[PDB]
Structure formats: C-alpha cells, structure tokens
Amino acid sequence: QRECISVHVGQAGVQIGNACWELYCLEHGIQPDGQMPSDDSFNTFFSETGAGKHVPRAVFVDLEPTVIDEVRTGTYRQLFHPEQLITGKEDAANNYARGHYTIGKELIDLVLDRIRKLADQCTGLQGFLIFHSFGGGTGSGFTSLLMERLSVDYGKKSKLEFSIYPAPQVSTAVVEPYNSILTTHTTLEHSDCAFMVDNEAIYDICRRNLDIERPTYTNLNRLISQIVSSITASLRFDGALNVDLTEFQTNLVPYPRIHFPLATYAPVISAEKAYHEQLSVAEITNACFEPANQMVKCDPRHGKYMACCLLYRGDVVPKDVNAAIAAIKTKRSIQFVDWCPTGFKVGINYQPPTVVPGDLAKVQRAVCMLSNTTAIAEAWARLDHKFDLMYAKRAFVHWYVGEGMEEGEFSEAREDMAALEKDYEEVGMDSVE
C-alpha cells in the first residue's frame, strides 16, 4: 500500500544497504533467511512471496564485482533475490565518464528492467530512495544516469537521494571534486531531496559521543542506517503525526533548486553515557541543534535554517516536543530566515528504536532532524574552489575527455554551481522591500 523502492549504487551505496537491511530485519522480526519466527508493517520495504519468505524491495547495482559477492556469499545470501544484485565486469574507476557514458549502457537497461519489475507489484508507489556517494565513478555516473532515466519514466514520483558527501579534509580520492561536481550538476534538475551525509562529522561523533577511537565503515553505515530507518518509520508503523515522503518533499525544500538537507540523529549515546541522563525530549531536541551532532561538517551558526523536519521515534509525549520547540525558537544561536516564520515539520511515531548487536544503545527515544539551511553554501563553495584550483591547469581532464565526454561539460557544471551559489546568497539575504 504505502511502499518505497530502495536503490543502492556504488561501494558506499552497497554497504549502506547492507547496514540498512540488517537493521530492517531486526526492526521487523525477519530472520536472515527470510521466514519470520511466529502483520502488515513489513509491506513498505519487504515484499511477500509464497511460503512466507519475505524479500527486500532493493536493487543493488554496482559496476565491479566482489562487493556484491560479499553480500551473496555471506549470511544475508538467502534474503536477497539474486537478479536484484546486478554486477558489472569493469570498475568505473572514479570516472564519471565511465559511470555515465561507456559502462553505464551495458547495465542501465538491466537495472531499469528490474526497477520496472519491482514497480509492477506496487499498487501505490510512493517513491525511490537511491543510496550513493559523491565519490567513486559508479556512485557518481550510474546514479546520475539512474536519476535521469527515472525522471523520464516515473516523472510524477518522489525520488530522494542519500548521498555520502565528500569529506572536506581527508578525502579518499583525488578526482572527488570532478566526480561530485558532475553528479550534482546532472542530478540537480531531477533530484527532489538530497540528504547529505559526511564522513568527517561521523568520525567526530563516533569519537565524542559513541566513545570509539577506532571506528570502521560498519559503524559509520550503522549510524546512517539508523537515520534511514528513522525517517522511514511512519511508512512502516503507526504514529501520532504519520509523515510521508511527499510531505518530506513539500517541507524540506522551499525553492525548485535548494534541495540539500542535512541529517542529524539524537541519542547517539553509548551505554556508559546514558544511564546518567534522563534522555528527555527537551535535551534530545537540543542535541540536534548543538554544533557537534551535525553529520555534515558545516557550521550552523554561520548560516540560517530554512526548514527543520523533526522525526521523533519511540515513547514521545506529543507536547514535550511543543515545549522543546518553544524553548528553541526563543534562542539566538539558532537563526531562522525572515521569510519562513513557521519552521518545523514534526512527526511522531510510537515504535521504539531497536538496537543492533554492536555500537548503539537501547534508548526509549530518538529523533532524526533533517534541516535545510544556508550553511551548506560554504561546503559547496569550498569544493568549488577545489574544482577551480584543480581545473585551472587541466589536471586529470584527459581521462574524462578521452573516454567519451566532451570538454564543455566541465564548464557547464561550473556555471551551474556558480548559479547555485548565487541562489544560496539570494535566499540567505533578508528582506528590505
């Protein structure tokens, strides 16, 4: 009835999907095999076939092997339909040219055929959640192509993105500015809402609040999986303010182009750090707006919040959230834009957050805060500077231009981001008329 389709592209997308589905099976009661040990909460993300062997609505496509082969060899082998798991034979090799132009066409028809087949047993489709980074060639070019073709074929549907933002200080690649600039230039016109997730900030919150000096991508993806499960909780269970993906689309983004929210999570607290707290709704609301639980490394007080969508999960009284938002809207560290007196979209669900065997804690409350703000302009502009210095004397341009891309796409992307920066400044400017 109220279902959504998950797409996982890239190394980041595949392992985020791994964490998300091992969270979802524990959330529902589905064993790794598929049989539930024994009524309709499953129907949104888990389809049902004969002999009760519930299957995800996910397409795992990655252009290079062994990463899907971990999935189809490990413990969750018998959960996924193997024709969902789509593998290429050539790594995209951090080139958006190889993600969008040359090896995108041998696999795009197969992945679109499977996406249509999962749309077939879907009565009311709500939309897509596509999971990638702004890094590697697969998770850049293939998700750009997927957003283009999905906007072509399902243009009235809601398409949402979970994108791992390129880390502003360490990086894992030297062509990350090129790949990110191209994938966001070609997905700006088609994406409806792109949740940004960083790596630096999740490292910082894992050291400070999760109390692990040695975290891995398993822990990182588990935190992001908790984010995804927190926003997709109303489609799954019942609640007070039953919120929808279309409601996320109409709340998290004012203008046609300013559609890059930031996700934060509260109770990120780690067992010997929460026996000493009441974990009340007021302080777990304050923890979202503190400038350390931000999961994208941009400072909020150097900016203005456009719109905040708060997702409370678990035993939350519907009106300590009222007291908390009342306390927030009197402060001065949190600044709202002058054209948006209203500022909040509150959703409340009665299902408590489950605990995976691992890092996080068994907390009676949680809240996922998705904020559209002006502070992401600095994050975009610093990688624009990174593009300008790397492109000023034509670095790494020969692979991109010789694999099949024309030269002018770089200039078109740079002009599109100059326009995007100009939009950020125009929106952030206050009113005098």
Partner: protein, 428 residues
Amino acid sequence: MREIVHLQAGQCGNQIGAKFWEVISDEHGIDPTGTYHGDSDLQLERINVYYNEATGGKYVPRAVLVDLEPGTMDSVRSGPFGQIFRPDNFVFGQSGAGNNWAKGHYTEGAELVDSVLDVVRKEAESCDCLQGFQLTHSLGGGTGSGMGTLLISKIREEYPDRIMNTFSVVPSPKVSDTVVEPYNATLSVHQLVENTDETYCIDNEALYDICFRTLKLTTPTYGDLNHLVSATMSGVTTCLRFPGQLNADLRKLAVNMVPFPRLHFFMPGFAPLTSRGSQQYRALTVPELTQQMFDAKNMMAACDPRHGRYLTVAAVFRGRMSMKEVDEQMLNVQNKNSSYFVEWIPNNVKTAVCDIPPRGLKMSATFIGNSTAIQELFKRISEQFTAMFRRKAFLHWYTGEGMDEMEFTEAESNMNDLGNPVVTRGAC
C-alpha cells in the same frame, strides 16, 4: 427528528472523529460490538441523529471517513470503536496528499471527491429532514484542508439549505507542525468564508494551556486532546439529542450567533473542567460553572478575549439545574464586564438548558463565542502568508499542480476583507 451527517477529513479530523464516536457512543450506550447496552429508555429517543440502524439493532454511525492515505484509515479500523462504521464508507485512496492544498483540491482529491459525494448522497438521501453536516478537519496540512474545503464547496452547492459545522484546528503561534500551514490555512479559510454557517477553531496551544493549568496533567496525549475537542463537539448537539427546557438546535445556534454571514468563526469551551487534585475540593454549581467558563483560560482557541469585544456568547448547559441562577449569573456577567460585550447588541448571550448531563457528571456546559479576538488569529496567519509569499517561497508545488498567481492574492485579499469587518466592530 433532525439527522446530522458526520464527515472526517485529514488525519487530525479522523482521530478527532474517532474520539467523537468514542464519546457519544458511550454516552448513547452503544457498545463496541454495535448493540445497545444502556440503562435508560430516554437515551434511544433521538438515536436517529448520529446513527443509522441496520438489521438486528446494529447502530452504525452516519460518518463518512475520508483520507488521501490508507494508514490512518487502518488505524481507525484497529481502534476501539473501529468495527462500528460502515465498511463501504471507509472511502480511502492509494495516493499522496503530501500537505498541499493544491494536491488536495485540484488533483486526486478532486478525483476522489466524486465517490465521496456519492456516499454522502447515500447518507443524505436515506433521510427525511436533514439539518446539517459536520466536518472535522485541520486547516494546516493537506487532505483535511485540501479535500475538506472542496467537500464544503460541493456539499453546500448541492444541498444549499442545511447547516454546515466545521470543527477545524488552527495553527498556534508557539509552534507549527507543518511549514506550509500559513498557505494551507489561508486557502482553507478563503473557501470556508463564503460557504459555512458555523465553524469551531480549536487550537492545540490553547488545549495545552487548559490541560496544564486547569486539568493539571503532565503527559497529555492525542486521546487527551481530541477528547477535550469531543467534549464540546458532543455538547453543542445536546438540546437536539436530549429533552430540556429551552431546547435550541444547531440552526438557531446559527441564527443567534451569526449577525453577518462572514462573522461566523467561534471559540469553543467546555467547562466543568476539574483537576484530579482538586476534584474533592470542587463545589460544582452554576455560578462556578460560569466563572470557569468566562475566564481567559478555557477557550480552545489560542486568542485572547481581553483584546476585543464579544459579539455573541452561547451556553448550552446540561444537567438538572435551576435557571434563576443561570439568568442572574449571565446578567451579572453582562453588567460586570460590560465593556467586553458589544453595546449595539443588547442581551448578546444565549442560554439553552438540557436536563441530562453527560455520563459521569451532574453539571456540565459548553460555551460558544463569536468575538473580536479571532482578528488576532487572522492577522497572524495573514502576516505569515505575506512573509512567506513576498519571496515566492514553498510555492512551486502549488503552481505545478494547476494553480495561478492570482488565486493566492485573492485568498489574501479575502483574509483582509475578513480583518476589516472584525475591526470595524471594535470601534462600532
């Protein structure tokens, strides 16, 4: 008899109406299984105002439940009084409203409104003397705002001589539960103001001021809030439901509280409200009932009566009671705070007494106010709309569903053409 067709729009409206079909069901003695297990024979005499009957004494409500998303529908079916409604009347639709008034009124809302009108035609043709339709809805958000005002327009067009009651919740100044509530509230009120006859603006912040100050609760839930709503929303239709001296139906409530057709926005109030810590110290009588009525704490609309003049007060009392108290006490009020009542309407206060109190009480009363104080709510929503409309914000989905620029300006002009008559009365 005079049937009242009940209509649910939005998640808020569905849950409020679910608590309504809790409260009046266990008032009228209807069990969850649908049979009649009561104590008095007087409580079935006007059962043909909210419940149609079926074969075997199955009393089914005349409520049409409407939502653009089939999950609140399943919640209502899984609720306590879920197996009481007509199964065909669960008019759902596999689509997404998404808190857009355009997506509720010019789109699949306008695609499902035909079936909605078909089942309201069901419930209104199977009648003899229809009096009114009540709709429970939310001015903010969609569905209840989107298809709700559309339902108002079509229903008033195809039955033009019946009362329309709209129990509507309004956005509060302290918080907002949706970032497009100013847009949705403006477009909703623009369609409410040349259509309806009685509205009831119920504010959540005012509900919490009631629940925290008077009731002395710490963890109020939505069952709590919609039960406070359902108390007044049951109490207004009690002279029509039960015998009394000075019976007053919904239609003369309308003629007594509507001086001019635009000025029909009411602030409700239910006031035998006792905290549990002070129930044993309470001295329940009509004088204290009115003194707890008219203080600026128990109206369910978050707008201050001390910042304007009342145009009409109504009090529907319930319980066996001496009305020399009622007459002298409302006269003491009218000559006590005389400047807060308009001078051009002598005796602007109405009294309607029913013999039978709600179950669990001896002495109750609902208070309906048509006052100037709705100006503050209207000017607040108008200021929010001007602020968010000056720079075209949160608006391209409104345009992309088939709207125009001029409709928003017409709605804003209609808001200001509501603000003008409610401020002319403040200076006579």
